[PDB]
Design a protein around this ligand. Structure first.
Ligand SMILES: CC(C)C[C@H](N)C(=O)N[C@@H](CCC(=O)O)C(=O)O
Ligand code: ZN
Ligand code: ZN
Ligand code: ZN
Length: 697
C-alpha cells in the first residue's frame, strides 16, 4: 500500500507490517547495518544489493545500462550481446564515476541546522548561505575519515535534517549483463506497461584496495567483503504473499501546492516531453545511418524515451483521477481548517501565501530558465561552462567554493570529462546545438538574455548558422583537451580563442546572477515551506491519516503483497507473467526478438527446476501494491523472511500519476522474479560461476 516509510517510523508500522505477513521482527529491519537491510546499497540514482560475501552486487540491467554502454562500440556491442566474465579478472570497469554507497551511520542534526538558519535572521539569501556553510562544515567533519562520503538530507520541507555517512566504493566492475533482448525485452513499447516480460537484471562487483580502504580502479584492488548479503528465497513466491522493498526513491510531490501541481501538469511536463521527443527524433535518424552515433547516444536515448513516456503517462493519469480537482478540494479543507484555529494557524497561512508568490516569480522566467539550462547541457557548452566555473572556484579557499566545485567533487568532474568520450559525436552534437539555438530564438525578448543576444549577434537563421560554424572550431571534443582545461587557471580561460570557452566566459556573469536569484527564492522557501508542511502533517494527523515524508533520495521501506489490478470493467491483470508469454510476443525484430536459446528452452519446456506449480511455468515478472518511484530501480524485493524474491524495475502505466496524487486501485510495482533471473543464467545466457557463488548452482 501507500507509503515510503523512513526507518525511524518502523515503530509506527510494526503492526501493519505483521498483518500484511512480515515474519521477521520489525526490530531486525530497523537495524540498517544488519541482516538484511545492511546488504542494501545506493548507486546514485538506483538501488542495488550485495548477494555474496565476495562483493557481487545485483541491480537492474537499465541501472547498469550506462556502464554497459561505456564498454560498448559499434563492432563489440555489449548492450546487444550481453557480457559475462568467467573469472573476476575478466570483469570490466563500470567507469570512473560508478559508485556503491554502503550505509554506515545516520544522525539527526535538525536542531543544529535550524539554529544555523535562524542566525541568518530575516534575509533570504543569507539563510541559504548559512545552511550551505552549515552543510559544508558538517560534511567536511563527517568525511575526515578516509573512504567515507556523506550527505545531508532535508525531510518534509525543512522540518527534519539527517546526516548519512556512507562508505564510498570507487572501483565498481561489470560482472554480467544479459543480452538487451532480455534485459530490455519489449523496448520502449513495453516500458511503463503491464503485461511485462522483461529480464531487467545485471551484476556488478565491488572492489577496494589491498588495505581494505576504497580506491579508484587498479588491478591490485580486490573484492570487497560485505558484512551482510541477501540469499535467494527457498519458498516459491505466489499471489497474495507478503513482500517488501528497501531502497532510495528520488522524488515525490504529494505535499505540493495545488498551483505547483497545475504548473507542472500544464507547463513543465508537456514542454519537457516535447523537447525530448524532438531530440529523440533527430538522434534516431542519425543512428539509422551511423552505428557509431547509435551506440554512443544509446544511454541518452534510453533516458529521453523513459522520461517523455513517463510524462505522457502522468498527464493521462491526471485526467483519469481528476488530480486538479483532488488537489484543489484537499487544499480548501486545509486552509478552511487553519482559519478555524485563528492565531494558532496564522503562521501556516502566511507560509501558504509566500509559497504562491515564490511560484509566481519562478513562472515569470520559466521559459528562459529551462531553455538556457538545456542549451548549456549540450556536450561542448556544458564542458566549457563547467570547466570555466571550476577555474573561478579554484581561486577561493575550499570552504567557500560552491557545492559541485570543491576538492571532494574533483574526482566526479574529471571522470565525467572522460566518460563523455563514449557519448559524443561532433556531427550529432551540432544538430542538438542547432535545435537549442532555434528554441532560444523563439523566446520573446521578454524571456531573453542580454549576453546570449549579444553573443549571437542577430536573431535569425543566418545568426544560428554563424554560431554553429563558430563553435565547430572548439577543441573540447577531445578528452585530452578537456583534461588540460580541467587544470588551467581562470586567466587562461579568459585569454582563450576556443569558441566554446569564449561562450562560457561571455555567459558566466549572467549564469551566476541567475544562480543568486535561485538561492534567494530557496532561502524564502526555507522559511515558508517547513511551516506549511508541519501544518499539513498536523491536519492529516487530525483526519487520523498515514504520515510519511515525500521522497528525497534517502533510504525508504515500502511493503505490501503480490497482486494484480483491474484496468477496466470486465478485466483483470493477473499477478504473474510466464515464459510462454515471452514467446507469444516474439516477432523476430526489435524489440521483440528473444535469443534463440530462450525460444528453444521454452518450446522444449526446460524449466530448470524453477517451475512454480501454481502457474505451471517459470514466473517472469510480477505485480505488487508497493509504493515506488524513480531511484527504486534495482531495489531487492524481499519476502516474509527477508529473502530475495525479485528486483523492482518499473511501475504500471496507470500508476505514474501517483507521484502527485496517489491512486491505491491502480498503483503497482513491476518486479523481475528471482527465478527468471536464475532461469536465464542456467538456460539462456549462462553464468554457472555466479550461480555457484550465490549458492544456487
Ligand atoms: C528503462 C525502463 C525499464 C526504466 C523504467 N521505466 C523506470 O524508470 N524505472 C524506475 C523505477 C520505477 C518508477 O519510476 O516508479 C527507475 O529507474 O527507478
Ligand atoms: Zn548476512
Ligand atoms: Zn587525472
Ligand atoms: Zn511442470
Amino acid at each position: 500500500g501507500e507509503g515510503m516509510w523512513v526507518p525511524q517510523q518502523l515503530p509506527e508500522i510494526a503492526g501493519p507490517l505483521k498483518k500484511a505477513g512480515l515474519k521477521l521482527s520489525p526490530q531486525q529491519i530497523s537495524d540498517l547495518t544488519g541482516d538484511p537491510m545492511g546488504a542494501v546499497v545506493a548507486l546514485g540514482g538506483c538501488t542495488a544489493s550485495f548477494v555474496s560475501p565476495n562483493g557481487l552486487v545485483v541491480t537492474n540491467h537499465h541501472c547498469a545500462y550506462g556502464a554497459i554502454q561505456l564498454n560498448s562500440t559499434a563492432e563489440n556491442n555489449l548492450i546487444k550481446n550481453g557480457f559475462n566474465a568467467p573469472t573476476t579478472a575478466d570483469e570490466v570497469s563500470a567507469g570512473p564515476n560508478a559508485r556503491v554507497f554502503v550505509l554506515d551511520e545516520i544522525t539527526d542534526v535538525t536542531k543544529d541546522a535550524k539554529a544555523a538558519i535562524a542566525a541568518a535572521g530575516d534575509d533570504a539569501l543569507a539563510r541559504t548561505k548559512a545552511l550551505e556553510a552549515f552543510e559544508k562544515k558538517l560534511i567536511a567533519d563527517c568525511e575526515a575519515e578516509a573512504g567515507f562520503r556523506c550527505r545531508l538530507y532535508s525531510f518534509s520541507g525543512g522540518n527534519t535534517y539527517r546526516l548519512f555517512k556512507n562508505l564510498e566504493i570507487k572501483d565498481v566492475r561489470l560482472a554480467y549483463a544479459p543480452p538487451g533482448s532480455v534485459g530490455k525485452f519489449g523496448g520502449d513499447i513495453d516500458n511503463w506497461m503491464w503485461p511485462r516480460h522483461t529480464g531487467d537484471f545485471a551484476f556488478y562487483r565491488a572492489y577496494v584496495g589491498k588495505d581494505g580502504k576504497p580506491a579508484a580502479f587498479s588491478k591490485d584492488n580486490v573484492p570487497y567483503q560485505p558484512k551482510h548479503w541477501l540469499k535467494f528465497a527457498d519458498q516459491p513466491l505466489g499471489a497474495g504473499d507478503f513482500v517488501m522493498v528497501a531502497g532510495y526513491p528520488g522524488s515525490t510531490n504529494r505535499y505540493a501546492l495545488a498551483a505547483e501541481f497545475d504548473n507542472t501538469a500544464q507547463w513543465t511536463y508537456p514542454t519537457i516531453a516535447r523537447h525530448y521527443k524532438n531530440q529523440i527524433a533527430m538522434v534516431e535518424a542519425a543512428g539509422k545511418q551511423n552505428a557509431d552515433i547509435q551506440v554512443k547516444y544509446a544511454a541518452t536515448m534510453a533516458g529521453w524515451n523513459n522520461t517523455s513516456k513517463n510524462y505522457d503517462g502522468q498527464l493521462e493519469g491526471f485526467k483519469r483521477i481528476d488530480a486538479a480537482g483532488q488537489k484543489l478540494r484537499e487544499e480548501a479543507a486545509v486552509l478552511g481548517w487553519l482559519k478555524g484555529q485563528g492565531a494558532k494557524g496564522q503562521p501556516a497561512l502566511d507560509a501558504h501565501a509566500k509559497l504562491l508568490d515564490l511560484l509566481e516569480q519562478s513562472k515569470a522566467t520559466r521559459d528562459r530558465d529551462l531553455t538556457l539550462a538545456l542549451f548549456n547541457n549540450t556536450a561542448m557548452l556544458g564542458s566549457a561552462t563547467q570547466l570555466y566555473r571550476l577555474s573561478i572556484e579554484r581561486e577561493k579557499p575550499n570552504a567557500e567554493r560552491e557545492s559541485g566545485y570543491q576538492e571532494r567533487d574533483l574526482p566526479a568532474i574529471e571522470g565525467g570529462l572522460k566518460q563523455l568520450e563514449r557519448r559524443y559525436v561532433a556531427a550529432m552534437d551540432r544538430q542538438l546545438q542547432e535545435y537549442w539555438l532555434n528554441e532560444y530564438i523563439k523566446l520573446p525578448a521578454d524571456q531573453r538574455v542580454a549576453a546570449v543576444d549579444a553573443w549571437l549577434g542577430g536573431n535569425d537563421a543566418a545568426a544560428v548558422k554563424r554560431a554553429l560554424d563558430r563553435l565547430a572550431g572548439t577543441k573540447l571534443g577531445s578528452t585530452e583537451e578537456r583534461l588540460k582545461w580541467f587544470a588551467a587557471d581562470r586567466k587562461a580561460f579568459e585569454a582563450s580563442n576556443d569558441p566554446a570557452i569564449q561562450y562560457a566566459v561571455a555567459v558566466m556573469p549572467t549564469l551566476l546572477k541567475l544562480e543568486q536569484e535561485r538561492k534567494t527564492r530557496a532561502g524564502e522557501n526555507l522559511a515558508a515551506r517547513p511551516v506549511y508542511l508541519q501544518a499539513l502533517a498536523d491536519y492529516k494527523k487530525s483526519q487520523g491519516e498515514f504520515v510519511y515524508p515525500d521522497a528525497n533520495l534517502s533510504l525508504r521501506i515500502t511493503f505490501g503483497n503480490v497482486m494484480g489490478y483491474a484496468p477496466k470493467d470486465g478485466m483483470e491483470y493477473t499477478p504473474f507473467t510466464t515464459l510462454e508469454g515471452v514467446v507469444a510476443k516474439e516477432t523476430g525484430q526489435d524489440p521483440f526478438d528473444s535469443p534463440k536459446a530462450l525460444l528453444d528452452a521454452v518450446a522444449a519446456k526446460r524449466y530448470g527446476g524453477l517451475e512454480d506449480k501454481r502457474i505451471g511455468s517459470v514466473p517472469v515478472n510480477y505485480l505488487s501494491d508497493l509504493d515506488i518511484t524513480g531511484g527504486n530501480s534495482g531495489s531487492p524485493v524481499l519476502d516474509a523472511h527477508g529473502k530475495l524474491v525479485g528486483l523492482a524495475f518499473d511501475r504500471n502505466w496507470e500508476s505514474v500519476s501517483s507521484n502527485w496524487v496517489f491512486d491505491p486501485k491502480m498503483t503497482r510495482m513491476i518486479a523481475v522474479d528471482g527465478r527468471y533471473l536464475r532461469w536465464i543464467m542456467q538456460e539462456v545466457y549462462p553464468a554457472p560461476q555466479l550461480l555457484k557463488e550465490m549458492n544456487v548452482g
